[PDB]
C-alpha cells in the first residue's frame, strides 16, 4: 500500500513536468533514465477498453 | 545533547544519510535513518522447532 | 558491551555472582586461562599465613538450559588489584558490565 | 497417564517386509506361517513338513514352500529364517561380491567340513581340504567374521 | 565510436588502501562500469586462508593450555585473521614454535621461501609462564568465497577453521568530470579499494575485467539406469533344458523381461507346467527377486 | 514461518528435509518403479543414505 | 580452478511477436544475474546508435498551439505521431523529407516522398487525418542520428517545432532474476530478459550489439 501510494502522487514542480508522452513505456524509459520524476505532471496518450 | 554529540563526531544532525542500492548502484530517493542498535538472540531456535 | 546503556550494567554483573571478584587487594602473581593467583598486600594478611588467593575459573560447563558457562580472565600478569575488583568475566559480561 | 507405546520386534519387521513383497494369496499364507515359525535368534524352529501341514490345503507341494522360504531368507537381516548354522552361513556368503580374497575356500569349508572346525582339529582339516596353514588362517578368520545370530539386530 | 577508458594512475595511500583511476569515459558509462566492478571485486577475488590447525597437546577447541593466556577458541579466532601471500602453490604448511613469557605473534612463524607474512605484528597468543612453550602446525590453501568448516576420518586433535578467502575489505567509486583536450562531456572513474594487503590493486582490476568479459561473451553470440542384476542374460540363471527352451520360445532374453511377467502369463504359455514355474520362482528367489515387478521405460537401449 | 516475497499465490515454500520425511512411501514406490531399487529394503537404505 | 566460473547452458528464446522477445539464461553464479542484467539494461536504454526525427515545420503553423484548419488533430498530436516514426537511414547523419497531401482520409507514412537512403519500416503508421476535400497538408521533417534519448527542453527561424528524439531502437527493456540449482549447488541465478523494439532491428541483434559495446569497453584491462 505504501509503495503504490507513493508512486501515484503528484508534486507541484518536479523534474520533467509538462511534457507530452506517447505512452506508458516512454514514461518508464524516462523514469529509469533519470530524466523525469515519478511525480511529474504530464500528458500521456492512453488506450482503454470497455 | 544528542545533536551536539553528533556534531562533535562530524555527522549529520538529522541522523539520516543517503544510501545506494547494492544491486543497481542507484541512490534511494529519500534520506534513511542509519545507526547502531543493540540486538539480542532469543532462545527460540528453528533447529528445536522443525 | 551495549555502547548505549543506563548505568545499571555493573551492578547486575557484580551482584549476580557470575564473575570472579577479588576478596583482598594485592598484585597478580599468576594469570592463566583457567586459574588466577593473587599475592595479597601485607597490610591485609593474617598472622602466620602465606598470603595468596587462588581462583579457579569455570570452563565450558553445562547450564540448566543446556547452554555454556565459561569464565575468562580480564587481568594481566603483575598488575595491582583492590578488593571488589573484577578478575574474570562470566557469560554475557564484558570487563565487569552486563553484555547481553 | 502414560499408557506406553508400541515396539517393533523381529517378526513385526519381517511381516512388514512380507506385506510389501509381490506374493500371491497362497504365497502370502505360506510366508505368514514361516514368519510365525521364526524365533528370536532368526532361525526356523519347525520342519517344512509342519508348515505344509499347517497350510491346510492338499494342492500344495513342498517345492513351493522351499521357494517361499528362499525368498524370505533374503529379507533384512540376511540369513534370517535359516534351518541351521550351515545354511545361515551359506546364505550370508552368497551375497558377497566375487572379488573377496577367500570366498571359495570359506564356502568349501562351510559346505563340506564344518564338524572339523567345531572340534578344533586343524590337522585332519588340512589333509581333507589339501590346504596349507597360510590360507587356512585367513579362511577361518573370514568365516568367524559372519553373523551367527542374525535375528539379534532387532533385539 | 566510443572513447575507451585506460588505467591512468594508481595511488598507494597505505599498504592496505589504494586508489585507481580510469579515464576517459563516455556519458553514463562511469556508473555502468563502477557498479559491476564493485560487485565483482566484492564477490569473486581469490586469496589464501587458514583451514586447519594442529596444536601439540590440545584435543579439541573447548579446552585450555597451561601457561597460555587465551583459550583455544580465541587462538583459532586470531589465526582466522592471519594474512598470508603464497606465490608458488595452492597449499602450504607453516610451523610455529615459541617459548618463554611474552606475546606470540606472526613473526615467530618458521621462514618459508614461497610464503610471505604481510603483517608480522599480528598477535596470536600470550605465554605467561617461564617454562611454557607452544608448537603448532598451520595449513594454508588458496580459494575464493566463504566456506564454513561444517560444509566440508580426521584424527583426534586436528581443528578446523572457517575460511574467508576474500582479500577485499571494501570498495567505493566516484565519477568526476575529465578535462580532456577538446571535449567537455567525458567522465573519470576513481575506485577506492581497501584490502588486507595480499593482492595488487591493478591485478584485481584486471581480474575483475576478465571475469566480466568472459561472462559477457555468452551474449555476443546469442542463440538457442537400471540395476545391474536386471541386465544379465537369462542364461545366467541355471534353469533346466525345458525351462530355458520355454523362456526362449517367449523371446524372454534378459532378467528384466522375465521379472515383469506374472505367474498367470507364465502359466498360460504352452509346454510350461507348474513344476517349471516353481523352479523359475526358486531360482529367482535365490537372488532375491520375484515375479510381478513393474518397471518404467524398459528396455534401456538393450 | 517466514515470508516469501517471490512466491505466487498458489505456492508455498517447504523445506526439503521435511518433505523427504513427509513423502517417504511415495519415494519408495517411485524408486522401485524405475529399477533404481529392487527391494523395499534397498529403497529404505538408499533413502537413509540420502543419495 | 579458482579462476573458473559457471557459464550459461540452457538458453531459451521466446518470440511473443516480431518485435517482442523473452530470453532465459541459466545457470549463473550467485549475484551475476543482477550485474549482467543491470549493465545490459543501462546500455540498451542510454547509449544506443539510431536515427530519429528531430524537428518539423508546417506552412500554416508558427506556434505549437496554433491552428491547421482541415486537420482532424492538433499540432501536438501530429508531433506525437511523428515521434513514433521508424527510419533506416543508410547514408549521411542528417536527412530532410517533404510531405504533401490533399484529399479526404488518413495521411500515413506511405505518403512521404521517396528517398534513396530512407527506408520506412511501417508504412501503415498514421500521421494524421484530412476531413475536407479542399484541405491540404505540407510539411518538412528532419531526421538525424544519435544515441539514446534527448529531450527537446534541453535544446531551448520561424515555425520550427522541436520534437523529442528517440534514437535508440529500444522501446522497453526489463529483467528478472530467479532461483536455479545444479545437483550440488542450490544458490544459482537464472536471468530472464524481456524486451520490445520499434521494428528497426530485432531484439536479439540489439542484445548482441549492447554486449559487444560493453565488451569492447573493457579491452584495455582484459587478460
From Swiss-Prot, chain C:
Co-administration of salinamide and rifampicin or salinamide and myxopyronin suppresses the emergence of resistance to both antibiotics. Disulfide bonds: none annotated. Acetylated on several lysine residues in the presence of glucose. The RNAP catalytic core consists of 2 alpha, 1 beta, 1 beta' and 1 omega subunit. When a sigma factor is associated with the core the holoenzyme is formed, which can initiate transcription. The rRNA transcription and antitermination complex (rrnTAC) consists of RNAP, NusA, NusB, NusE (rpsJ), NusG, SubB, ribosomal protein S4, DNA and precursor rRNA; S4 is more flexible than other subunits. In pull-down experiments interacts with CedA. DNA-dependent RNA polymerase (RNAP) catalyzes the transcription of DNA into RNA using the four ribonucleoside triphosphates as substrates. Resistance to the antibiotics salinamide A, salinamide B, rifampicin, streptolydigin, CBR703, myxopyronin, and lipiarmycin can result from mutations in this protein. Belongs to the RNA polymerase beta chain family. This is DNA-directed RNA polymerase subunit beta.
From Swiss-Prot, chain D:
Transmembrane segments: none annotated. One of its GO terms (cellular component) is cytosolic DNA-directed RNA polymerase complex. Keywords: Arginine metabolism, DNA-binding, DNA-directed RNA polymerase, Nucleotidyltransferase, Sigma factor, Transcription, Transcription regulation, Transferase. The keyword Transferase applies. It comes from the Bacteria. Belongs to the sigma-54 factor family. This is RNA polymerase sigma-54 factor. It comes from Escherichia coli (strain K12). The gene is rpoN. The chain holds residues 111 to 265 of 477 of the full protein.
UniProtKB/Swiss-Prot annotation, chain E:
Residues 226-302 are annotated as: Alpha C-terminal domain (alpha-CTD). Keywords: Acetylation, ADP-ribosylation, DNA-directed RNA polymerase, Nucleotidyltransferase, Transcription, Transferase. Residues 1-223 are annotated as: Alpha N-terminal domain (alpha-NTD). Its EC number is 2.7.7.6. The keyword Acetylation applies. CDD domains: RNAP_alpha_NTD. InterPro entries: DNA-dir_RNA_pol_insert, DNA-dir_RNA_pol_RpoA/D/Rpb3, DNA-dir_RpoA, RBP11-like, RNAP_asu_C, RNApol_insert_sf. It comes from the Bacteria. Acetylated on Lys-274 and Lys-275 in the presence of glucose. PatZ controls acetylation of Lys-275 but not of Lys-274. The modification ADP-ribosylarginine is found at residue 242. It is an enzyme of class 2 (transferase). It catalyses: RNA(n) + a ribonucleoside 5'-triphosphate = RNA(n+1) + diphosphate. Gene3D superfamilies: 5' to 3' exonuclease, C-terminal subdomain, DNA-directed RNA polymerase, insert domain, RNA polymerase, RBP11-like subunit. GO terms for biological process: bacterial-type flagellum assembly; bacterial-type flagellum-dependent cell motility; cell motility; cellular response to cell envelope stress; DNA-templated transcription initiation; intracellular iron ion homeostasis; nitrate assimilation; regulation of DNA-templated transcription elongation. One of its GO terms (molecular function) is DNA-directed RNA polymerase activity. DNA-dependent RNA polymerase (RNAP) catalyzes the transcription of DNA into RNA using the four ribonucleoside triphosphates as substrates. This subunit plays an important role in subunit assembly since its dimerization is the first step in the sequential assembly of subunits to form the holoenzyme. This is DNA-directed RNA polymerase subunit alpha.
Swiss-Prot record, chain G:
GO terms for cellular component: cytoplasm; cytosol; cytosolic DNA-directed RNA polymerase complex; membrane; transcription elongation factor complex. One of its GO terms (molecular function) is protein dimerization activity. The keyword Nucleotidyltransferase applies. Keywords: Acetylation, ADP-ribosylation, DNA-directed RNA polymerase, Nucleotidyltransferase, Transcription, Transferase. The keyword Transferase applies. The N-terminal domain is essential for RNAP assembly and basal transcription, whereas the C-terminal domain is involved in interaction with transcriptional regulators (such as CRP) and with upstream promoter elements. Belongs to the RNA polymerase alpha chain family. Homodimer. The RNAP catalytic core consists of 2 alpha, 1 beta, 1 beta' and 1 omega subunit. When a sigma factor is associated with the core the holoenzyme is formed, which can initiate transcription. Both the N- and C-terminus interact with different regions of transcriptional regulator CRP. The rRNA transcription and antitermination complex (rrnTAC) consists of RNAP, NusA, NusB, NusE (rpsJ), NusG, SubB, ribosomal protein S4, DNA and precursor rRNA; S4 is more flexible than other subunits. This is DNA-directed RNA polymerase subunit alpha. It comes from Escherichia coli (strain K12). The chain holds residues 4 to 233 of 329 of the full protein.
Amino acid at each position: 500500500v505504501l509503495g503504490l501510494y507513493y508512486m501515484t502522487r503528484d508534486c507541484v514542480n518536479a523534474k520533467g513536468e509538462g511534457m507530452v508522452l506517447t505512452g506508458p513505456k516512454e514514461a518508464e524509459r524516462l523514469y529509469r533514465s533519470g530524466l523525469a520524476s515519478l511525480h511529474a505532471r504530464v500528458k500521456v496518450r492512453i488506450t482503454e477498453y470497455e | 545533547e544528542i545533536k551536539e554529540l553528533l556534531k562533535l563526531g562530524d555527522l549529520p544532525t538529522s541522523g539520516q544519510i543517503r544510501l545506494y542500492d547494492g544491486r543497481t548502484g542507484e541512490q534511494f530517493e529519500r534520506p534513511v535513518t542509519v545507526g547502531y542498535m543493540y540486538m539480542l538472540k532469543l532462545n527460540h531456535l528453528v533447529d528445536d522447532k522443525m | 558491551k551495549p555502547l548505549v546503556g543506563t548505568g545499571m550494567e555493573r551492578a547486575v554483573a557484580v551482584d549476580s555472582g557470575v564473575t570472579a571478584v577479588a576478596k583482598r587487594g594485592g598484585v597478580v602473581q599468576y594469570v592463566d586461562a583457567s586459574r588466577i593467583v593473587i599475592k595479597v598486600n601485607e597490610d591485609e594478611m593474617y598472622p602466620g599465613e602465606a598470603g595468596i588467593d587462588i581462583y579457579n575459573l569455570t570452563k565450558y560447563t553445562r547450564s540448566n538450559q543446556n547452554t555454556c558457562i565459561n569464565q575468562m580472565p580480564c587481568v594481566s600478569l603483575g598488575e595491582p588489584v583492590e578488593r571488589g575488583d573484577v578478575l574474570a568475566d562470566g557469560p554475557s559480561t564484558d570487563l565487569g558490565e552486563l553484555a547481553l | 497417564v502414560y499408557q506406553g507405546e508400541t515396539t517393533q520386534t523381529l517378526q513385526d519387521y519381517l511381516m512388514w517386509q512380507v506385506e510389501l513383497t509381490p506374493f500371491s494369496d497362497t504365497d502370502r499364507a505360506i510366508a505368514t506361517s514361516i514368519v510365525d515359525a521364526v524365533d528370536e535368534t532368526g532361525y526356523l524352529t519347525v520342519p517344512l513338513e509342519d508348515i505344509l501341514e499347517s497350510i491346510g490345503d492338499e494342492e500344495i507341494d513342498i517345492d513351493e514352500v522351499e521357494a517361499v522360504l528362499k525368498r524370505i531368507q533374503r529379507f533384512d537381516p540376511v540369513g534370517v529364517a535359516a534351518k541351521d548354522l550351515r545354511d545361515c552361513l551359506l546364505i550370508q556368503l552368497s551375497q558377497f561380491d566375487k572379488t573377496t580374497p577367500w570366498l571359495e575356500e570359506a564356502r568349501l569349508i562351510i559346505s563340506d567340513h564344518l564338524d572339523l572346525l567345531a572340534n578344533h582339529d586343524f590337522r585332519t582339516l588340512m589333509r581333507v581340504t589339501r590346504l596349507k596353514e597360510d590360507v587356512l588362517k585367513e579362511a577361518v578368520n573370514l568365516i568367524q567374521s559372519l553373523d551367527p545370530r542374525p535375528g539379534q539386530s532387532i533385539q | 565510436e566510443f572513447l575507451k577508458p585506460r588505467l591512468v594512475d594508481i595511488e598507494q595511500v597505505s599498504s592496505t588502501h589504494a586508489k585507481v583511476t580510469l579515464e576517459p569515459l563516455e556519458r553514463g558509462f562511469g556508473h555502468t562500469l563502477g557498479n559491476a566492478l564493485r560487485r565483482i571485486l566484492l564477490s569473486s577475488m581469490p586469496g589464501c586462508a587458514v583451514t586447519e590447525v594442529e596444536i601439540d597437546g590440545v584435543l579439541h577447541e573447548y579446552s585450555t593450555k597451561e601457561g597460555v593466556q587465551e583459550d583455544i577458541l580465541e587462538i583459532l579466532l586470531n589465526l582466522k585473521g592471519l594474512a598470508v601471500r603464497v606465490q608458488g602453490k595452492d597449499e602450504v604448511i607453516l610451523t610455529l614454535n615459541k617459548s618463554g613469557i611474552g606475546p606470540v605473534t606472526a613473526a615467530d612463524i618458521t621462514h618459508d621461501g614461497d610464503v610471505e607474512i604481510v603483517k608480522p605484528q599480528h598477535v596470536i597468543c600470550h605465554l605467561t609462564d617461564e617454562n611454557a612453550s607452544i608448537s603448532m602446525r598451520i595449513k594454508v590453501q588458496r580459494g575464493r568465497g566463504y566456506v564454513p568448516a561444517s560444509t566440508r576420518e580426521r584424527p583426534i586433535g586436528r581443528l578446523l577453521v572457517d575460511a574467508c578467502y576474500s582479500p577485499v575489505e571494501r570498495i567505493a567509486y566516484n565519477v568526476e568530470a575529465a578535462r580532456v583536450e577538446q571535449r567537455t562531456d567525458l567522465d573519470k572513474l576513481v575506485i577506492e579499494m581497501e584490502t588486507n594487503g595480499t593482492i595488487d590493486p591493478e591485478e584485481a582490476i584486471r581480474r575483475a575485467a576478465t571475469i566480466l568479459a568472459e561472462q559477457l561473451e555468452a551474449f555476443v553470440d546469442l542463440r538457442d539406469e537400471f540395476d545391474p542384476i536386471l541386465l544379465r542374460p537369462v542364461d545366467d540363471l541355471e534353469l533346466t533344458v525345458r525351462s530355458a527352451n520355454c523362456l526362449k520360445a517367449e523371446a524372454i532374453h534378459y532378467i528384466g523381461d522375465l521379472v515383469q511377467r506374472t505367474e498367470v502369463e507364465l502359466l498360460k504359455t504352452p509346454n510350461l507346467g507348474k513344476k517349471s514355474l516353481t523352479e523359475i520362482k526358486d531360482v529367482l528367489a535365490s537372488r532375491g527377486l520375484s515375479l510381478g515387478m513393474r518397471l518404467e521405460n524398459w528396455p534401456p537401449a538393450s | 514461518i517466514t515470508v516469501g516475497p517471490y512466491l505466487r499465490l498458489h505456492q508455498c515454500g517447504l523445506p526439503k528435509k521435511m518433505a523427504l520425511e513427509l513423502f517417504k512411501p511415495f519415494i519408495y514406490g517411485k524408486l522401485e518403479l524405475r529399477g533404481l531399487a529392487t527391494t523395499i529394503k534397498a529403497a529404505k537404505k538408499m533413502v537413509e543414505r540420502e543419495e
